[PDB]
Amino acid sequence: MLMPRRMKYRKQQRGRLKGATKGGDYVAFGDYGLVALEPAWITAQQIEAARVAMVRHFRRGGKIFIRIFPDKPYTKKPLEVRMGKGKGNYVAVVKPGRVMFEVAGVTEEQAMEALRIAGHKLPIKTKIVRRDAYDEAQ
């Protein structure tokens, strides 16, 4: 689905969405990227919604990178009220300026119209990008 195997701890505190993406952010694997303009918990099921929209969009062809991963467990109570925490029930924290997704090996006009679909499945505003000198060398 997308999810770790093996966790150290089952549940973990919410924390803030403060700041800028802190890495990720420079477009390392592909010809075109999708970058986050807003912070959000992006869900294993939103990610896979986007991934499939793109493969469906081209031919089973192309190449797709993803590059954000849902390692943060997301609890919810049932309709109860208050005794303990839990349960269940996975997100990836995503700050502004991060490259998620990022396709390659496809025509610009394909990638861009697929990346546009892809971001319609996301809770945040997004930006399509290309690739650069600015994405350096390393």
């Binding site: 800028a20 993406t21 802190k22 952010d25 420079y26 970058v35 502004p96 300026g97 990008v129 650069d132 000198a133 600015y134 350096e136 060398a137």
Partner: protein
Amino acid sequence: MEYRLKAYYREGEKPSALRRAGKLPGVMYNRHLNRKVYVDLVEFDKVFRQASIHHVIVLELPDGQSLPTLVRQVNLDKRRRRPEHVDFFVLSDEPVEMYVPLRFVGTPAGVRAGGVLQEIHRDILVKVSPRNIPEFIEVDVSGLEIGDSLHASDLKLPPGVELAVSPEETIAAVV
């Protein structure tokens, strides 16, 4: 093929202002120098899209000297993804490490049209005497078959100068 920009100096003059000003803070340095400079953003941009830490940029700037720089850093701030500052490395004649682009030459040359092409590096890091700087590298290897990993020194090595290696890594492959 050959590139120059401009450059100016600065001492005080807070970066935020300069950056509001259409200009682009940066620094000039090398073993014998370190100096505070700025440039025009819109000007710099056009050049850097081209040069891109691959070709040499000769600056200009007042005095007027004209200084043979390699760009060795660009900090783009992550929110707007747009350069906030630039490192300009000035050459002198002592060997210096750097990034050379890569010319992949051929047809798929076996399993042609085709397997999958898979270029694993658009660059290589190489120690080079500034004087002779091999502005690209033709790499063909018409052997070019399914599954292999070409290492390093199997590259042309345009005449001037040696790898900054590692000699064993992954350049391309077909599958």
